Each structure stands twice: as structure tokens, then as C-alpha cells.
């Protein structure tokens, strides 16, 4: 994660988006932060309101990341845009480009206290996007 | 409820006491406040931050006041200190007497957002202790 | 507003981004919606949740929209990207072109009861960016 | 402490209350503990989530347990209850009586890392009352 953004708002830049635009442009906003492009990455079409709602599910193992049990299923789908890397042999980030597949999937997040600089609406905020199902 | 708290705050009052005396004087805290004495009043022996837990999970009609169905069911049982009035019939609020029921049980909260006097850290908080199963 | 959007998440759409492309690239989300290019907008870079909080502040007369008094201004400035059209005589949207001004201002906002799609968590949702100071 | 409470929950017991009944009552629930009556002890009117928030303030060192340096000044005053024991010749706990003395002060607490049976919303709980100001 990028300082300039608490883990929640580095959730929020990549995983929440109401109109993304396609994969490809969307996806710069991710990459200029990284050092190679991200091979996937899923836009949730929510909102974070939304997402803190399934911080309160009941607690599970995370699936893709499964030393930590602080994950949450969302009761209910959302649609959403996957996007996946196809060209991992690019020079610049800049060239990295996307197959968008867009969807309609439960999600599963993890979920931490805030950071003193969230807003204080949301003692409990997503960190991560485990997996979709 | 009485002016001097929030709703949250005679919620705590009411229903949430770790360690609370014997009916007939825990009683004596909610009934100085209230015209004639309450007929029955559980407390949960537990934490605000658990029934705030309580607040999160689905949400369904209220069993006891149907009009509503922003109510929670907790998903495990809490020892608890039921209160029963068993002298309807007399003179002073500081006459009132109370039959003992300690107990352990699934309960049912109303839940709203908070009122801008309560703490950050609970945007969402129990207001009303609707039942227990 | 398009259909598929509250008020409130119309307003998100288009004035609340973090992290937003150049205004060239961002007013596209914005102008796919419409016949003609927008003449200006600013996009704030802070969350809505934030911004929900500023509805709570003192009611005040709409700057630039006076026949209403449902408006709130922020205590802080945020930074925001403020984009104004350089091409107006545009026949495809796609071919508007913006210049971007970055800054750091107190935000005025128009505030009403939320949408029932729009999550409980805020009753009062801010849904229209009224002007910068 | 008693073992069928965590420190963060002693605390509570003992310094947490905001309704509280005159001390001569409010200090039975914690003189059922032990042999001999308390000498003094302050009861905070304001929530533990609003103590949690002064663990977040500024370490200084413990004006009462200076072996110490994780306490925290709150940065307003709340209403409390301070009681102060009038009969210590007393044989039985149950007579005990105390002086009231209603107030309203900075309170200082030592916080630490919460107990695993605490909510997970803290990691950081209050542990002891080291003085009010």
C-alpha cells in the first residue's frame, strides 16, 4: 500500500468503484503505485457502506489468505469488474493492458479496525479483497 | 428514556451490567427514573462492544415490537439477570421488589445509529432489548 | 441523474475521487451520461463518509443555488481537482478536452434524507456539490 | 482482580458507571472482592468506549505508579463519583460506609494491550484508574 492512503482507502481505490471505466484504463490508477502491474484485480460495483456491512458477518478463515481468520462473506452478490493482466512480457506499466470480464459474485473481505485517519463512521473498515465466489 | 442519556446510554443502563446486585436493588437505578415500576427488566451480563457485535448480524423483525425490523439476534447465549416485579400492588417506586432469574440466553436487539453525544467508536448502537430466547 | 444511481451516489460519481486521472480522463465518467460536455466540476479527494459528516453542520442558504437552505459547509478544506472544459464547440464527448486545476478548498454541500436504496447508515446523504470556498 | 474478569473488565467494575447509587452501595459490588474495604475509589460517569478513546492519547508517566509510563490523561473532564471510606475500624465488608463525593475532573488510566477474551474493537483497553486532576 501507497502511505498516502490507509489501508482502507487503498481498499476503497482498488476494489470499490460504482462505474469503473474498462480494465485497461482502470487499472492505471493501481499500477502507477506498483513496481510490475498487478496480474488481477477486482472492482466491486458498491459502495463502501456496503462493504462494511459484510465487516459485520460472521468471521471466517480467510480462503486466499489463510493465516488470518478475520475475513467475512457477504451475504448477498454484487456486480463487479474482474479484470486480468494478458500481457505480463510489457516494458512500462503503462503498457500493461486487461481482459475485463465483468460479473456478479458474493465477495469475501478482511476486516480491521480504522486508522485514526478513516473517518470515524466506520470504527471497522475492509483491508483487503480475499476472494469473490 | 430519560433526557439526561442517549438511547445507548439507557440501553447500558437498563440491560448491560457485568456484575449487577440482586433484582430488587438493580432495579432501584431504572425505576427512580420512570413513573410506576417497570414490570420486568433483564440485564446482560456482557459488554456494550459484544451487543454492538449483535447490532451487525441480520436483520429481522422484531418478536416484541413488530412494527419494526431493525432487530438483531445474537448468534451466542450470555448469562443474564432476569428481573420479575412481584409486587404490582404498592405504594412507592422505592417499594418495588423484584424476583431473582439468573440465566443464560440468546437475546434480540433494536439497533439505530448513534445519537452525536455517544462515542465514535459505535456509529451503530443497541436502543431497545426486545427479547430473549 | 441517470436512473441507475441515488442522488447520493450520483453525487459520489461525481465529486468524491481519492486518486483521480487527469481531468481530461476523468470528466469521460461523467460526460458518458450526457449530450453535451460539462462546463465544470470538481472532484474532492476525500471519501463520502467524510463528506455525510459535513451534512451535519450548520444548515445554510446555497451559494449558487439560493432558493435552497438545505446546505452545509465543511469546518476543513480537502484537497479536490478541479476541472475546467477548454473545448466547447466538442461535437463527441469523447473529444472534450479539460484543464485540470489541483487544490485545497472548504466545500459546500446540498444535503437531503437518503434514498431507501441508500445504506441506513447515513439518513442524510449530501447530493449535489454546491460550490468550493 | 477477581479471575472472571479480564483487567479491561475490573476496570470497568470498578471505575465505570454512570448512574452510579450513593458509594456506600456502589462500593459493596466491588468490597465483595475483599477482606477489607477499599480506602477510596472513583467511579467515572462516561462509557468504557469513551475511556478507550484517552488510551489513544499522549503515553505519559503513571502521577501515582511511576514505575510506570503507558497512562493517558483524558483531554476533557467528565463527571464522577469519588468515594471515601468513613468507617475503616469496619469487621464485615458489608459495613462499610463512604463519604460521596460528586465532582468533575481530568481522569488519568493506564492502558494496555487488551486481553484475548476482550472485543477485538480495542486492542488497547484501560487497566487501571492511576489518578484524576
Same mark, same amino acid.
Given at each position: 500500500?501507497?502511505?498516502?492512503?490507509?489501508?482502507?482507502?487503498?481498499?476503497?481505490? &482498488?476494489?470499490?468503484?460504482?462505474?469503473?471505466?474498462?480494465?485497461?484504463?482502470?487499472? %492505471?490508477?493501481? #499500477?502507477?503505485?506498483?513496481?510490475?502491474?498487478?496480474? &488481477?484485480?477486482?472492482?466491486?460495483?458498491?459502495?463502501?457502506?456496503?462493504?462494511?456491512?459484510?465487516? +459485520?458477518?460472521?468471521?471466517?478463515?480467510?480462503?486466499?489468505?489463510?493465516?488470518? #481468520?478475520?475475513?467475512?462473506?457477504?451475504?448477498?452478490?454484487?456486480?463487479?469488474?474482474?479484470?486480468?493482466?494478458?500481457?505480463? +512480457?510489457?516494458?512500462?506499466?503503462?503498457?500493461?493492458?486487461?481482459?475485463?470480464?465483468? +460479473?456478479? %459474485?458474493?465477495?469475501?473481505?478482511?476486516?480491521? #479496525?480504522?486508522?485514526?485517519?478513516?473517518?470515524? %463512521?466506520?470504527?471497522?473498515?475492509?483491508?483487503?479483497?480475499?476472494?469473490?465466489?
Amino acid at each position: 500500500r501507497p502511505p498516502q492512503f490507509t489501508r482502507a482507502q487503498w481498499f476503497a481505490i &482498488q476494489h470499490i468503484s460504482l462505474n469503473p471505466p474498462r480494465c485497461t484504463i482502470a487499472m %492505471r490508477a493501481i #499500477n502507477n503505485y506498483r513496481w510490475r502491474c498487478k496480474n &488481477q484485480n477486482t472492482f466491486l460495483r458498491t459502495t463502501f457502506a456496503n462493504v462494511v456491512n459484510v465487516c +459485520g458477518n460472521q468471521s471466517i478463515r480467510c480462503p486466499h489468505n489463510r493465516t488470518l #481468520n478475520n475475513c467475512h462473506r457477504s451475504r448477498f452478490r454484487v456486480p463487479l469488474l474482474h479484470c486480468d493482466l494478458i500481457n505480463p +512480457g510489457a516494458q512500462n506499466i503503462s503498457n500493461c493492458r486487461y481482459a475485463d470480464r465483468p +460479473g456478479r %459474485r458474493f465477495y469475501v473481505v478482511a476486516c480491521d #479496525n480504522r486508522d485514526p485517519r478513516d473517518s470515524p %463512521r466506520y470504527p471497522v473498515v475492509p483491508v483487503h479483497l480475499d476472494t469473490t465466489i
